[PDB]
Amino acid sequence: ENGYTYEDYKNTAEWLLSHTKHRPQVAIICGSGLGGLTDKLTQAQIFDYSEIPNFPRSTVPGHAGRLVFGFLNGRACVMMQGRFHMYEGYPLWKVTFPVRVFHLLGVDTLVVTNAAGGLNPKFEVGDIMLIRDHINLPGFSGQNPLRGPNDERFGDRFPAMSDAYDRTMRQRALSTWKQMGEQRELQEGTYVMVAGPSFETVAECRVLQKLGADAVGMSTVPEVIVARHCGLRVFGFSLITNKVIMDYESLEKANHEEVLAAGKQAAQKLEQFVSILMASIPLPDKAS
């Protein structure tokens, strides 16, 4: 919304289109440490956020912030390596800008990935959690990417989000995990978005737990919301990079070298899993 006008999304979509032979069907948003997925593309055309018109450039990253087009396991993709977060200063209408243009490019599905902390006791670090639902803490307070006058050309005023995370895709995902003969199971739960850049206190770790959250993070939710408003099929995963909740002798506290989640090894596992699912995402062709 604000700051951006429809023609803005229009000019950015047309520009990209006229600058790439590619026409994407699936946009993929890589979470921290899941950018290597871009290595899995064939015929990649890399665009630096900066080159792309109204596209929000990176506050610091950049060189870990690019939009790369290609083909992944059957599908025509567009991967955003290095996503925007509101903790970096971007208003939510800049953070979710990409999604609006992906819609105008022709994208019909959005797989969003992220790194998150483990709230559910079952979860072990390294785990992967299929996002079945979410709790939008910023949104309850006004920080919803849809705020402002609504463009009925994109969507409705009051979109429902109870059915956000595609049921089929999540079923097919659970099945694909099994068909791969995977040992540690594909977990599943509610992701709670929290804004601030600092990590949580035990007291905070307990309210999110009490609220029903399984993994906590600082992104995804805004993009899921504007994806859905546009009518995109959405599904995502969370790479549990850590976990906490004990005043009673924390013995640790986290920082960032912790948010690696077995680094390469565990990240590679999501990257291939995600690539395997390209086959399981419906062709626009109708494929009947």
Place this chain on the structure above:
Amino acid sequence: ENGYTYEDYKNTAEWLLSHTKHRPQVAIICGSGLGGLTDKLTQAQIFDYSEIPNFPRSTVPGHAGRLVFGFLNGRACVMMQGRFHMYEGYPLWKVTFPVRVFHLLGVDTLVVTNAAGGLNPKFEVGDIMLIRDHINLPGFSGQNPLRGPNDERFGDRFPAMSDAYDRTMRQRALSTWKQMGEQRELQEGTYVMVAGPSFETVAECRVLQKLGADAVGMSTVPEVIVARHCGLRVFGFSLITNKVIMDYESLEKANHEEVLAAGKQAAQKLEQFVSILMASIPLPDKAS
């Protein structure tokens, strides 16, 4: 606050006053589908938000956004048909502007109405819920209409809200429902304001439930707060237009054609009920 200065409220009050023979004692804010209450006025003087000076115009509505003066069942009213919401972009000091000017017009009571979703299991759609209390989610985070320097000419710095919804008015309301010989009872509970324009996920529907909320909505609370700061008697109702909370087979999801709450029929029931209560609201005359 911000954007508005006292003389602004002053000029808007004086202008309206000098433009209307009417001097209101009760301001009524109509929720979605409760604008027909304006049909119940006698000697209506209709002002388009736009004509009124510093008055925030409607982002899209307008022609469902007007301030109409008149008499309703004994009382001298001023009804706002088409209220402002923060999900439309209005900062909370624009959303609650009317209340500040109604105070300067002479208003001493404010009946606020709204449409809300049912969180309490008891509630059936079509129901009416007497607002006994509220949970201000945006306010916990900073989105409180009172934020900014405080004008002691309007009120205190730290107004108490534990006694927001007038006890007497709510008693008289419960009684009036019974005197009307009403079948389905007048429900009563805590209203939780949530900002974002999109509707809630099941996971979100469960935190609001856990927090103690009975009906969820996206307005009222900001206006109740600035009404009280001014010293106005406040009371309101919620037209339960829908209800949800089940990951375990939602089978539905809502949108907006759902938020009708038996449309006309149920809305008419609140509109007359509200008109009947004009008799039950104390005359400034002291009436002793």
Place this chain on the structure above:
Amino acid sequence: ENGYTYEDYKNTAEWLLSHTKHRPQVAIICGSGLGGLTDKLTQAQIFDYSEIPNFPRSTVPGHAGRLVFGFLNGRACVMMQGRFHMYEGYPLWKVTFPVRVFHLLGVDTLVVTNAAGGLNPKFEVGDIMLIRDHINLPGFSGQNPLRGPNDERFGDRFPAMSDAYDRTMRQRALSTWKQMGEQRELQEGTYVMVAGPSFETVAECRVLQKLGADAVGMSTVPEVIVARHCGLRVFGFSLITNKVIMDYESLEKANHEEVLAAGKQAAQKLEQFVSILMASIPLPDKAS
């Protein structure tokens, strides 16, 4: 962050330094009614917020808003009498500005004090609560003082806050309370920051209770967060000035004359307690 640049904190630190013979080791932030602690200083050099460069002046206070340097029970202090709150309009990067400059002055410890309402049933007004942890409601929604690009010269991007309130200092504080032979014990619990200037409804008083909060307030948390990001040892107390949570016959409601907490008497008790603890805060000298 925003609005302020590093050189800004730099110029304000150097200016103060060049304007005071003093070099502080402990910054103390006085809560409502705890400003008399400034009376306990020796060799005080008082600076009006206004005189100090980029320093946010007071929205109304001022004459209850000053930065006074001196010595308190062994330590070289800098006390902020009259702290900034976001309910007054200050963006969180103005509210927490002092802390950033105190860091540049040489401060290594920050004792923050505040007045709060009692959520825990045990607490009696007049009580003092050692802040062992907190729940940052504004931060969950985006209102975190660290938001914006991160200055690695001050700290990391994702600072941990699970270990915010210094364990040792809190142990030494508990001990000092006992060594003083104090009757009513030094309480301890989780402080929940809430923004809005108005006070809470019973319904709101119950969510904070359910969330695990022991005392509710409208400050401290933002400053604790930026203090920690800088690497400062932080510890604080809360003067329980009141308490509520009963729809079922509130019988009272609060306002501000209530937030006195036995005024002088109870405030004096925290002021001396705080002064006694100067001895218990480690000299930068290493003191080995």
